[PDB]
């Protein structure tokens, strides 16, 4: 059943972001100490896939989100016919192909040895579906007939020599079906959760127009309106510290890049 979640209770400031493993959320700790002298309570409702933050948001449950990059964002207004906004940048983390695994082993430690009729598992929503597909492309596994900013599908795979099954799932599973696929593409949301190791993947997505793969802070667009927009404006600056610039690059071993 859609949108499982759990909350994680600290002017009070609902947040809604996708849950992450070990340490990755030390940096939501941190702000908090921040902002206590500010009279600010920070709470978060946790979602477990990128389909149900930015409902939460556009329907007043929390107050910003925290989970997306910038063309996740601007897909999701287009189809749902919303105007969400983004109020700061994050960080970056290029996605990663990985190696499916037998046991605790990954079964191939380059691409050229996945095999002839692999499986590589990719994500199923539109931007990081085609993130994943570009990633393949760069990687030279499949052609597209597709490029620059045209969102790649399935569809649009043009060469496959290795007559790889290209399987969609939802981005929250990916991680998981390492241990039944030949590869997998996974966002660095699921990386933890899974035990990966993201230093020993196959293949990194290739910065060039990175900055759409930004993460970002989001509100509503009248959010500024809001009697919340001095404590929103406070939280802003708190992430945007030089500590918390350290919490995040220490607290996730470098899978997350600070871009402020
Ligand atoms: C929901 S869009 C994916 C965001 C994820 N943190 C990434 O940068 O890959
Ligand atoms: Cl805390
Ligand atoms: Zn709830
Ligand atoms: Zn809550
Ligand atoms: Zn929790
Ligand atoms: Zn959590
Ligand atoms: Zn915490
Ligand atoms: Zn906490
Ligand atoms: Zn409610
Ligand atoms: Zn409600
Ligand atoms: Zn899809
Ligand atoms: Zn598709
Ligand atoms: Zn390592």
Same mark, same amino acid.
């Given at each position: 059943?859609?949108?499982?979640?759990?909350?994680?209770?600290?002017?009070?400031?609902?947040?809604?972001?996708?849950?992450?493993?070990?340490?990755?959320?030390?940096?939501?700790?941190?702000?908090?100490?921040?902002?206590?002298?500010?009279?600010?309570?920070?709470?978060?409702?946790?979602?477990?896939?990128?389909?149900?933050?930015?409902?939460?948001?556009?329907?007043?449950?929390?107050?910003?989100?925290?989970?997306?990059?910038?063309?996740?964002?601007?897909?999701?207004?287009?189809?749902?016919?919303?105007?969400?906004?983004?109020?700061?940048?994050?960080?970056?983390?290029?996605?990663?192909?990985?190696?499916?695994?037998?046991?605790?082993?990954?079964?191939?430690?380059?691409?050229?040895?996945?095999? #002839? $009729?692999?499986?590589?598992?990719?994500? *199923?929503?539109?931007?990081? =579906?085609?993130? +994943?597909?570009?990633?393949?492309? %760069?990687?030279?596994?499949?052609?597209?007939?597709?490029?620059?900013?045209?969102?790649?599908?399935? #569809? $649009?795979?043009?060469?496959?020599?290795? *007559?790889?099954?290209?399987? =969609?799932?939802? +981005?929250?599973?990916?991680?998981? %079906?390492?241990?039944?696929?030949?590869?997998?593409?996974?966002?660095?949301?699921?990386?933890?959760? #899974?035990?990966?190791?993201?230093?020993?993947?196959?293949?990194?997505?290739?910065?060039?127009?990175?900055?759409?793969?930004?993460?970002?802070?989001?509100?509503?667009?009248?959010?500024?309106?809001?009697?919340?927009?001095?404590?929103?404006?406070?939280?802003?600056?708190?992430?945007?510290?030089?500590?918390?610039?350290?919490?995040?690059?220490?607290?996730?071993?470098?899978?997350?890049?600070?871009?402020?």
């Amino acid at each position: 059943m859609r949108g499982s979640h759990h909350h994680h209770h600290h002017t009070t400031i609902k947040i809604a972001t996708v849950n992450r493993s070990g340490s990755e959320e030390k940096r939501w700790d941190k702000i908090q100490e921040l902002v206590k002298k500010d009279g600010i309570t920070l709470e978060f409702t946790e979602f477990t896939d990128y389909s149900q933050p930015n409902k939460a948001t556009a329907d007043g449950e929390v107050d910003l989100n925290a989970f997306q990059h910038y063309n996740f964002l601007n897909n999701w207004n287009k189809e749902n016919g919303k105007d969400l906004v983004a109020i700061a940048d994050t960080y970056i983390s290029p996605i990663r192909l990985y190696s499916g695994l037998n046991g605790s082993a990954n079964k191939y430690t380059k691409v050229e040895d996945i095999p #002839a $009729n692999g499986e590589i598992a990719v994500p *199923n929503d539109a931007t990081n =579906e085609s993130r +994943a597909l570009y990633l393949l492309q %760069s990687a030279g596994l499949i052609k597209l007939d597709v490029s620059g900013t045209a969102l790649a599908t399935v #569809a $649009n795979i043009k060469e496959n020599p290795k *007559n790889l099954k290209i399987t =969609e799932l939802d +981005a929250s599973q990916t991680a998981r %079906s390492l241990s039944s696929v030949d590869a997998a593409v996974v966002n660095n949301t699921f990386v933890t959760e #899974a035990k990966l190791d993201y230093k020993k993947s196959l293949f990194k997505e290739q910065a060039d127009n990175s900055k759409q793969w930004y993460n970002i802070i989001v509100a509503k667009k009248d959010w500024e309106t809001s009697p919340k927009a001095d404590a929103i404006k406070k939280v802003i600056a708190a992430y945007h510290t030089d500590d918390v610039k350290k919490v995040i690059e220490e607290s996730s071993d470098g899978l997350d890049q600070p871009v402020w």
